[PDB]
Amino acid sequence: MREIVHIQAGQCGNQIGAKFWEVISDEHGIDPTGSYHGDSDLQLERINVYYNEATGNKYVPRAILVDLEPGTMDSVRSGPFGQIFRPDNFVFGQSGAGNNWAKGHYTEGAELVDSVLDVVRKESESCDCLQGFQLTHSLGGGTGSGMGTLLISKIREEYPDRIMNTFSVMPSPKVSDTVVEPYNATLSVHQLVENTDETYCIDNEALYDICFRTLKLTTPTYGDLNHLVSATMSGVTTCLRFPGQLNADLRKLAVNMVPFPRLHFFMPGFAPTVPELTQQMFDSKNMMAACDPRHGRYLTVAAIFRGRMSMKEVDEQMLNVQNKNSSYFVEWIPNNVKTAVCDIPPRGLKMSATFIGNSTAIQELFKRISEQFTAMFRRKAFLHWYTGEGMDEMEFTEAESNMNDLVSEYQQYQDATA
Amino acid sequence: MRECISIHVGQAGVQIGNACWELYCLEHGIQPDGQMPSDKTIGGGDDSFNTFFSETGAGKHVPRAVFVDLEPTVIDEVRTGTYRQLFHPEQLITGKEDAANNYARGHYTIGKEIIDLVLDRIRKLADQCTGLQGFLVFHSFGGGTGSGFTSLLMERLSVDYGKKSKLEFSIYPAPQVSTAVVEPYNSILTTHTTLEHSDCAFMVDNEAIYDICRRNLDIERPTYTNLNRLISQIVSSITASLRFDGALNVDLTEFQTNLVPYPRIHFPLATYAPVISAEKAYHEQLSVAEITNACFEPANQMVKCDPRHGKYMACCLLYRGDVVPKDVNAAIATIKTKRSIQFVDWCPTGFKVGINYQPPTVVPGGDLAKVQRAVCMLSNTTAIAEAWARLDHKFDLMYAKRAFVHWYVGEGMEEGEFSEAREDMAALEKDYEEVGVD
Amino acid sequence: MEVIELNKCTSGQSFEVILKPPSDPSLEEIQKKLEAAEERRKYQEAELLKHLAE
Amino acid sequence: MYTFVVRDENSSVYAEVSRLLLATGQWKRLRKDNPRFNLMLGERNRLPFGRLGHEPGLVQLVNYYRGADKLCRKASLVKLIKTSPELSESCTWFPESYVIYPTTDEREVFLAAYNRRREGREGNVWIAKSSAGAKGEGILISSEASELLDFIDEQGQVHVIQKYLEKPLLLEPGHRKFDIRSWVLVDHLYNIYLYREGVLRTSSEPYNSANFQDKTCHLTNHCIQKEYSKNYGRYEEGNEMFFEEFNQYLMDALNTTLENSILLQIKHIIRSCLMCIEPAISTKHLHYQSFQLFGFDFMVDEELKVWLIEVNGAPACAQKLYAELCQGIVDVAISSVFPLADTSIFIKLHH
Ligand SMILES: Nc1nc2c(ncn2[C@@H]2O[C@H](COP(=O)(O)OP(=O)(O)OP(=O)(O)O)[C@@H](O)[C@H]2O)c(=O)[nH]1
Ligand SMILES: CNCCCOc1cc(F)c(-c2c(Cl)nc3ncnn3c2N[C@@H](C)C(F)(F)F)c(F)c1
Ligand SMILES: Nc1ncnc2c1ncn2[C@@H]1O[C@H](COP(=O)(O)OP(=O)(O)CP(=O)(O)O)[C@@H](O)[C@H]1O
Ligand SMILES: Nc1nc2c(ncn2[C@@H]2O[C@H](COP(=O)(O)OP(=O)(O)O)[C@@H](O)[C@H]2O)c(=O)[nH]1
Ligand SMILES: [Ca+2]
Ligand SMILES: [Ca+2]
Ligand SMILES: [Ca+2]
Ligand SMILES: [Ca+2]
Ligand SMILES: [Mg+2]
Ligand SMILES: [Mg+2]
């Protein structure tokens, strides 16, 4: 009754999105046919936040799957839960984007966008009171990057008073499978800076090191990387999906986490005793973005504990980490660490701890991308492929300046005193 | 007999109101279905408990209360709870999206859309009143609705009911159970806007309530139900004089004349004792002089402050149960010899005392133990300004950087209202100093 | 220590114990501030939809 | 480990306690307004006491007692003594004093006693003082009340008039004046610890009762002896005589000891002063706890009677003694609340 509309764009967005629905469907006891087969009834008290309810008590995800090529859309339909989605919500083209942000944003994605907004509008109109949107996508490709931010912009025009959240896979510091990723990511960041309320930054190199070093998967795959993300997306959305009152809707969470409108890029974390969890959740090696928190200060933090646990012990150890490392929390935002607890644990574990941090250390990620981008743009390398789709150079100059401005802002607040 | 209407605004206001009204029903013998066997005037009456309860021809007793929130999850519990039949749906008002811990959103954006239906539903209650005393307004400082919408309604109530009195029961923000980081903002803004419309406000810092429940009830992690049940006791002991025969505080006007010589300084400190755990099969009972002496220990106050470093302007002692005046004055004289109790030069050093022979009523299954004498003291001491100093300092640290201000400007409020509200608290902190300091 | 103004009834008693003697906006104004707040919001939405139209 | 904050950088005593706590390896210093501290070494004026004890999960301690100002300033101390039954306007160890305001004011009562003793031709030399005067200035000594009542209206801050001790004990050689300084530590349990080591702060010129003009012969402040007379430093280093030397002088020159002749009265005055305020400043039931180090200033007359002249709430130690005292502060007042990892220098005054 405070509904959210989920959108997934491009290959990465759709594969991450697909398994996010696997995780939470199991948590709410929904089976691939859409029928509920659970034990408790807190699985359904807030089910309508992510599921439309239908005929004969079958719950359909309020999800819209978007890509410019049908391939990855076919695997989703072939997957374990491929059958649970409303078939009218598969909006796909045939041309693809060629790893080109311009194609996704301006030419190929332009032809397909109105069809997506048609589906979005139909979903939103069946919402007692729409809350906001969440998008999953990568920033290094063409569709989720170029078209994904086009959808965001069109969505904000029809729904300017609604919250726009994203889970955004960013370029990684050392690994890359495409040459023009800096152009795609920088252009998309400029969009997110302006048109999202909360973005969770994920990169595959950090996702991978957890899989290999921690979970000891000797040969990790995108499938393993995506299960980590999906488990984290379940964690960060626990308070939206189960009865609580800390960060219960998208707006309240944004009011508590975003002190300044542009600094809305978050570092997620996940773990795995009560003193054990709270130590891990704060460790560098549990962040899904490749930024070290001890290189900056937290402006705000949102910790979420799941399972049966002494809330007394949790409260006590949360305070011990804050007071133990007081130097890493801005002194001009009092009580900026909020903790929530949910009794529903994730499957496989019994006590989870998901971490959402708004640290100025995130500037390191925007500086990596900015250094890569300038190295190419100073020589205009590969630029003709973008101006050939109709773009102007200043559109790159503006994108570079804005992310560089974003970096100075993070540092301006990284040094502020009381 | 003059009637009082209670208005519960926001989540805290609603959930506290529902504990109070449950507690009123037990004290008066009213059952969940509104039937009061003890009431012999069927379908009417001029009794003192009628100040809070209406009556229908069918013999039901209906609280003179209105519950309002900007989202329906909380008020729905009232529509579904033990005491659902008590209220007619007209008294329960729901928006659909709340104020998102944003004062400006609850006061300006959403408040304007709903303020007027709320006033109609209030007027529906006032129309049933032969002479209406005024309003008791339960709300929180930190919520978006509790701070934003409450201040809007107070402004309107000062117009639709210009002469009637308004009392607040405010929940002051405490980080150990707080929901939002911007609660200092919402607290300063609603206090500034409400100050000149409240005749007397009883603040309850959730920190104090939280630590009492931990110390004296052995609750390792107090919940809202634990806090509200303790709160409703202190509330009930304050409103008892309006619901029972007596000659002290029988009128919302008396609360101000007895406790507030200065309009702006209308925040009396409440101290309550004894709070004893019901898990103790028995607790060797306490004296009048001991519970009375406990009224001057900061660990029993609703707001942690040091009255020793301020001055009193008024003090009221509200006893419940086996108490007689001679034992009270014995406790007072002996207590004045061992305590630091300095009144202002321009006021008499004295205590107004009220006694109600009915011992405190407890909720079955609660953590509070049935006692045979309890006392609540209401003292207007300048030491309560410590709570303003704490809030103002937190407000200052965040506002120096304009942290979170964009959320309020985005709702149509001007940055100036921040400075304006803070300057008002700066004046109030200083007026408290001219009074209670040399 | 005087004990003045003692009153008694079946439900209890009251009295006072001296120890030592001594030594708003118009309704129209309200609306005009809520309308100026609604206008500021509408101006902000307008400048956003203008820039999105660009 | 524990955390503390420094809010009076101008504190010799708490500067070195801060240095001591960091040498601990168990204490970390944050900066002024980081509120997540265990210990506050706070400022001297308008210390925000209302913001302490409200940080969840943190036992917080502060090195000042709220309300001790009523004892640690002149106008305050006079009214406290005269209006507190435990201390009695008839108090014997406090020189007859009167609060007087320039331009609740005992100017009419002071002249009553003034003429009462010129009627008896007794000594009528009085002194006026206040807590605006520093660097040894603001104070005047005379025998004509008119000279001191005109001099106080020449000011604008409230001063106190007090009978000058015309017959003080004079050290020989020298025939010089002196005052004694006792440092006392009050922990969070309100235990009153007296430092075993005091100091006699000296005058280096013979005591001339004939003229009070030269206030190097009368005002024993370390200020005016270092800076306006050249025999500062002759008899003892820095005009500071310590107890073991003063004890030998008393035995050798008067057949008595420091303990019997002076120290018993000192301990009695300390107890009386701090126990009269315990109800109003104690923090044993408070959401934060307090300690504080005080400096008591005493004068000794020729009959070996001790008199209190003032109490200092923000005192400085003597350079030879900073190490010993400042660590006693740590073990008794700080590590008492915050234990570390694992004889005495104080005299505990019972009560
Ligand atoms: N004692 C007590 N405090 C409460 C209760 N509910 C909320 N609070 C406190 O009130 C503050 C949160 O404000 P709420 O009243 O929940 O918010 P609201 O009035 O519903 O306004 P919005 O939800 O923002 O629209 C926090 O400081 C909580 O600690 C309650 O039932 N009892
Ligand atoms: C010590 N720090 C080392 C961190 C190693 O970081 C990573 C991240 C990944 F996301 C992958 C990965 C995975 Cl897991 N599955 C895949 N399926 C198809 N491609 N692909 C992947 N990457 C493509 C580019 C490649 F194989 F060409 F390299 C990977 F191998 C290493
Ligand atoms: N009633 C009195 N009789 C005799 N001598 C007196 C006196 N009052 C003060 N004095 C002397 O005058 C000196 C200055 O007085 P006082 O102690 O109050 O100044 P002060 O406040 O600067 C000391 P500190 O620097 O330690 O705070 C004292 O050292 C004392 O020797
Ligand atoms: N975690 C994850 N990342 C992916 C996956 N597929 C592609 N990516 C990432 O996204 C980039 C390729 O973008 P892609 O989604 O294929 O482009 P698009 O389909 O046009 O939006 C590379 O940087 C990959 O690291 C996936 O299945 N899981
Ligand atoms: Ca085409
Ligand atoms: Ca169309
Ligand atoms: Ca009746
Ligand atoms: Ca009025
Ligand atoms: Mg609410
Ligand atoms: Mg002095």
TrEMBL record, chain A:
Binding-site residues for GTP, renumbered to this chain: 11-12, 97-99, 138, 141-144, 176, 181, 204, 222, 226
CDD domains: beta_tubulin
GO CC annotations on file: microtubule
Localization: Cytoplasm, Cytoskeleton
Source organism, top-level taxon: Eukaryota
PANTHER family per record: TUBULIN
Role noted for this protein: Tubulin is the major constituent of microtubules, a cylinder consisting of laterally associated linear protofilaments composed of alpha- and beta-tubulin heterodimers. Microtubules grow by the addition of GTP-tubulin dimers to the microtubule end, where a stabilizing cap forms. Below the cap, tubulin dimers are in GDP-bound state, owing to GTPase activity of alpha-tubulin.
Listed name of the protein: Tubulin beta chain
Taxonomic path: Eukaryota, Metazoa, Chordata, Craniata, Vertebrata
